[PDB]
Amino acid sequence: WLITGTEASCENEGEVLHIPNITDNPCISCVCLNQKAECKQEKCAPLAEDCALVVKQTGACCEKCKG
């Protein structure tokens, strides 16, 4: 399929993994398990349907109503 890849390995079982350029987006996190990298993309609550302003906490993924 178009571009060709090899899935990444990693060494330390069960600990958080920081991949430059991937994992620095607040909504993406990885953890090394089974010698390979399992990552997740967190999902956010839909929010009060009358919010006019929205802010996200430093390092936070989901935005919330400022007001």
């Binding site: 060709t4 890849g5 350029n21 991937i22 990298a37 993309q41």
Partner: protein, 104 residues
């Protein structure tokens, strides 16, 4: 005119149509190679023997093309993509960033 050389190029996956299977990064600096592989040979340019031979042939039979300026050292990047059925998986992609150019 201008001689073989690396050049800037930022590649943006949305623009390329891939945003829908590549979740991250949103893009990257691929760079590219462009420029002439000239005659007289240019001492500073990396060329295989064959390229040198071909430059010489070109110099008298111009239906034979000059050597081409192409990537000659590349490097990998990591991408986070969606498999067959929505499983986020992390892979390393060889030969994605042009590190240096040469005549081939």
């Amino acid at each position: 005119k201008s001689s073989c050389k690396r050049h800037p190029l930022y590649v943006d996956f949305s623009d390329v149509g891939w945003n829908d299977w590549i979740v991250a990064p949103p893009g990257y600096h691929a760079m590219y190679c462009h420029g002439e592989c000239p005659f007289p040979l240019a001492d500073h340019l990396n060329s295989t023997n064959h390229a040198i031979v071909q430059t010489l042939v070109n110099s008298v039979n111009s239906k034979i093309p000059k050597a081409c300026c192409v990537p000659t050292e590349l490097s990998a990047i990591s991408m986070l993509m969606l498999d067959e059925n929505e499983k986020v998986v992390l892979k390393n992609y060889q030969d994605m960033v042009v590190e240096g150019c040469g005549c081939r």
